[PDB]
Scaffold this motif. Structure first.
Motif, short mmCIF file in Angstrom:
data_model
loop_
_atom_site.label_atom_id
_atom_site.label_comp_id
_atom_site.label_asym_id
_atom_site.label_seq_id
_atom_site.Cartn_x
_atom_site.Cartn_y
_atom_site.Cartn_z
N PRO A 102 3.93 6.46 3.98
CA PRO A 102 5.17 5.77 3.61
C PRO A 102 6.47 6.46 4.01
O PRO A 102 6.52 7.68 4.12
N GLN A 113 -7.85 10.14 5.24
CA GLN A 113 -7.17 9.18 6.11
C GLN A 113 -7.09 9.77 7.53
O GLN A 113 -7.46 9.13 8.52
N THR A 114 -6.65 11.02 7.62
CA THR A 114 -6.52 11.69 8.90
C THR A 114 -7.87 11.93 9.59
O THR A 114 -8.05 11.59 10.79
N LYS A 117 0.85 -1.20 0.00
CA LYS A 117 0.00 0.00 0.00
C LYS A 117 0.88 1.24 0.00
O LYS A 117 0.69 2.17 -0.80
N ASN A 118 1.89 1.24 0.84
CA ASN A 118 2.75 2.40 0.96
C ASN A 118 3.68 2.61 -0.22
O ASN A 118 4.08 3.74 -0.50
N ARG A 177 3.05 15.70 2.42
CA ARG A 177 2.65 14.82 1.33
C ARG A 177 3.88 14.57 0.45
O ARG A 177 3.81 13.75 -0.48
N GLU A 215 -3.71 14.67 -1.67
CA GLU A 215 -4.00 15.45 -0.47
C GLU A 215 -5.37 15.10 0.09
O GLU A 215 -5.57 15.05 1.31
N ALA A 275 -1.71 15.53 -7.30
CA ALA A 275 -1.30 16.09 -6.03
C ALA A 275 -2.55 16.43 -5.20
O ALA A 275 -2.58 16.17 -4.01
N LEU A 327 1.49 4.53 -2.44
CA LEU A 327 1.35 5.90 -1.93
C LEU A 327 2.63 6.70 -2.15
O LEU A 327 2.59 7.90 -2.47
N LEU A 328 3.78 6.04 -2.00
CA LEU A 328 5.05 6.72 -2.20
C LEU A 328 5.20 7.05 -3.68
O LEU A 328 5.64 8.14 -4.05
N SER A 375 3.15 10.09 -4.31
CA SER A 375 3.74 11.35 -3.83
C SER A 375 4.88 11.77 -4.77
O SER A 375 5.21 12.94 -4.87
N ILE A 376 5.51 10.80 -5.44
CA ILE A 376 6.52 11.13 -6.44
C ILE A 376 5.86 11.73 -7.69
O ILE A 376 6.29 12.77 -8.19
N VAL A 380 -10.00 8.71 11.28
CA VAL A 380 -9.54 8.00 12.46
C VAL A 380 -10.52 8.30 13.61
O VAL A 380 -10.74 9.46 13.95
N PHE A 399 -6.81 12.22 -0.29
CA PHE A 399 -6.59 10.91 0.34
C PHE A 399 -6.00 11.02 1.76
O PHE A 399 -6.47 10.38 2.68
N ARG A 400 -4.95 11.82 1.92
CA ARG A 400 -4.30 11.94 3.22
C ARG A 400 -5.25 12.63 4.19
O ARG A 400 -5.32 12.25 5.35
N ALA A 448 3.00 13.11 -7.83
CA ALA A 448 2.32 14.36 -7.48
C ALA A 448 3.23 15.56 -7.74
O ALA A 448 2.73 16.66 -7.94
N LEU A 449 4.56 15.37 -7.74
CA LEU A 449 5.49 16.48 -8.02
C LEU A 449 5.37 16.95 -9.47
O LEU A 449 5.77 18.06 -9.79
N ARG A 477 -3.51 15.69 16.34
CA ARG A 477 -4.30 15.21 17.45
C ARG A 477 -3.34 14.77 18.58
O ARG A 477 -3.53 15.09 19.75
N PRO A 526 7.44 13.05 -0.83
CA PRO A 526 8.12 11.78 -0.57
C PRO A 526 9.20 11.92 0.51
O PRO A 526 10.04 12.82 0.46
N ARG A 547 -1.28 9.06 11.48
CA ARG A 547 -2.45 9.53 10.73
C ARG A 547 -3.06 10.78 11.38
O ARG A 547 -3.73 11.56 10.71
N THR A 548 -2.86 10.95 12.70
CA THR A 548 -3.38 12.14 13.40
C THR A 548 -2.28 12.79 14.25
O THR A 548 -2.41 12.86 15.48
#
Lengths: 160, 160, 160, 160, 160, 160, 160, 160
Positions: free
Chosen positions: D110, C150-151, C122-123, D80, C144, C140, C126-127, C130-131, C154, C146-147, C133-134, E45, D82, E41-42
């Motif tokens: 990641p 994710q945040t 998964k990561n 976000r 964002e 990008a 995601l990595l 993020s590459i 929780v 997604f993150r 996204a540059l 928080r 890398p 993730r937080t």
């Protein structure tokens, strides 16, 4: 028809692992014997086995053991034949004990060590085949056919 | 006079370890070549080396590498010859990374793995000799003499 | 619509792990290909794959393997593209062998290594995101989003 | 002239390792900043650094830490961008604690992890370069030249 | 009735482990809150939680996490309160990654670390109780009653 | 002026590590005693020490040991006081035996375990201080000053 | 009829392992007692047990424990009798913690350590038998009969 | 005056460790022999030594070996006498290979294993003494005096 590889193991329960070596030699039509020899419970059986291996026409010995795995090393101590060692996966330490007790032979008496478990058993048989292929061109062709099919049979994309 | 064993390693710093294999083959009068081949920095050199080894008359390959040690496994991927692997001791992890990255080959492509460090290099030369001894009775006699002398040289009591 | 990430793995059974990478790229709408390439069984397929990766428009390669895991490292040996490595959990040693054989690359040829198993797959996706996204501001923004989800998702207190 | 990579580390003693990343970025003409940020002793400094990195024009972050090495993971939690992690070798556990505490990130955040020690620092700079090379064809040419020279510099045989 | 211990964990699945801490505090009638706070993730928080912990009347924080387990350490980075860390058992590495990433804190910011898994969760609650017993003689008596029953309840002979 | 923390260790050679705890308590003006108590060579001394600690006015015990490190666990078996454990680095296994034999206490008897070696000793004194700070607002102010100064002393960039 | 071996263990759940020791002593007709003694929960029970062992006519103590396994070592601290230690397999670390916390005794107080788990329990009983065989020629004959049957009963070939 | 303990080791380099056992038996006035026996280079010497030990009047065997340490296990395979094993510290793996290859004996053939290195050698002599003390009340008194003096010699506080 006389065996040129001996596959030996310390106990019946090792056979779940070592049968993969036995199957591979059969597939490649390499005459072999598959035996139980315990380093700890039948040390004299082991001394006799390794000492007479060469004169019986064996060319390679594949030995499997788990835990404090001494069978391959002691076998190498008594024969000049190449000895291949298969660490059997142990209950608690998952063959990490088997691996170290087989591979870390001091200089002077080698054991060619394969991966923990079934993959190691298969590869010990394949390594024995690549050794015997140096003496036997028909086997060498069968081994090449095996590696070629192995390579060609890998799919290009995974399935769901 | 042409080489029947190839000793390969990723770098000059590996030779501190692999020189022990080189010296032992010389001691046993086994013609060999000793070369640098880097799996990571010269992957095409490795492909050509391994691919042509058999046809050049090589019978056995001894490969040493440390860390993420990929030279032996990738060498075995391209040759049907037996490949013996020597884990070179690494700085941080003391060859445990070298060891696992060489010995844990999945089934289908073997590498006969020896001990971490100088002992392994020495035992790779001896394992290679025991393989060639199956083809060469003069070498077989030299190896048996080597082993007999090793056994006879062990003293009975330590010095204080 | 042409792939900008290649996800490769040594075998069908690796897909149980690598499908998490495949799913994540799809969720983020990153065009990609998902392929089987075995370092040990299809080394020429790997050489061709890595060598042509850049010119085919790939930007990042995610490679997964277990045991003596050589696929990511050898892939990095043949491409200047960033290569991300996912250690697949192995039966006996639970991916500790996979981890070391991927992460301990010597200096000169990198592999960006992720966690053992599904989390790593998964990561790696995601990595790679993020590459990419540059280069791609729409991506990008999706990353964002997604993150941020994710945040925000929780929970504050656990359930019985 | 503004930095596009940030190299961060918890302490002066980490620089013995991270200087290799710093030097390599300079060799490749990649503008960067090299800073001390402690996850444990300056957690607010870290939060601000990671949070503002993208908006300041950073593209990649290289973070080194040892022991319970939390700097890379926490940096990735707030950016976000890398994030590449370098395990710094620790006194007792020789970077195994550093390694596991960096690489074993759960899915969702990641860190691309490199080898323990100097090799990892060097490879983090190279991985960062391979990422930036996707945006910058001049750098891509420098990186390809670096790799070509690396390959050409490998000698064919060791010195005795 | 206001909480004097905070039990925090990164995810719902950590609760299978951390519920043992929650149960023990309840049995000893120690007012507490049981919360999900994810370091990765937080992170904000977490910063807010740890920073305000003391002024909210918390005396001890018990933090549980697995894998690259950063929650206890980062929590200790932002509070002067004692922070107790519970390594959650991870799938592949069985909490060995959790353990090292929690216990190996460099000097300056402590985390009092307990055993991997459920035993650690129980003992983090008991350790928090022994800390609070220094301020609260009624609790101190309940804790002594607990330890006395624990001791007296151990049978003398095993059962079939 | 009477001690409120006891620092105990099995041998003189442990003091090279535990002196860091001793010095830090002195720096924070925490009255303490520093003693040798061997779990294996003076088990009755340990029983009496731990059993009477609370009644003598001790609030916290810091115990250091290496190898099969039993001093902290056995100390906790006989006192309801909080016991903090410092793994002393061992010769062969570099404190990994020390670490596991201290941290892996079964549920029912806790030991709050710190890092292997000097860092752990320092952090045991700081964890002990953070515990006593709950009882003593003057100490709480000293600890907060210690932490603030630690944070302020971190430089912004490394020296080359 | 009075016991000459004491088998002790920390908890009921250890009995799944230690019953193999109990069974073996019974098979060899070695009078013994099988008891629960917890190092951590009943430290005074342990002190009394070990201190009086010799004068009660015990000749050997077999002690089993898991995790931070302190029972064998502390038992040896209080008796001059030989103490044999059985590491019980722990949930997370599979007895690697048990093994190190039992075997790494510093010089001065020994524990003769056996394998993790059931094999260790069986062998602790067999080792105790070989010790008692030095004093008791009838037992010595029964032990020889046992080893002879063990050796003779190993089959020659495995079954499918 | 005839030996009642045999100390055996594979090589002269092992004596740096095993001399501590030799010296301790002398200190306790236990007649013994100290010999080199290599499991790998003198396997027939080992077979004869172990097989005849009992009939020669030996009561206990102390065996030291490192790496793939097979001397103790194979010695126990051929004698009904109690065999104590000392893991000799190895170069790369620091005795972890020695330790696992000695302690992890499968059920049926025990080896009582002591700590890695000098501590283990010393404790093997002491464990051997505690065994012989069961047969010899004068030795039992010397051992009790040894233990009492050890306990009395522990200082109460460390030196700064």
């Amino acid at each position: 028809s006389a065996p040129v590889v001996g596959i030996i193991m310390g106990s019946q329960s090792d056979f779940e692992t070592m049968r993969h070596a036995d199957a591979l030699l059969t597939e490649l039509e390499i005459p072999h014997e598959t035996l139980i020899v315990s380093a700890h419970r039948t040390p004299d059986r082991l001394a006799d086995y390794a000492r007479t291996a060469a004169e019986r026409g064996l060319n390679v010995i594949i030995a499997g053991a788990g835990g404090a795995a001494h069978l391959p090393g002691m076998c190498a101590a008594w024969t000049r034949l190449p000895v291949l060692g298969v660490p059997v996966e142990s209950r608690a330490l998952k063959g990490m004990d088997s691996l170290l007790s087989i591979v870390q032979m001091p200089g002077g008496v080698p054991v060619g060590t394969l991966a923990i478990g079934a993959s190691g058993a298969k590869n010990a048989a394949l390594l024995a085949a690549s050794i015997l292929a140096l003496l036997n061109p028909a086997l060498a062709a069968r081994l090449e056919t095996f590696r070629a099919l192995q390579t060609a049979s890998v799919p290009n994309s995974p399935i769901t």
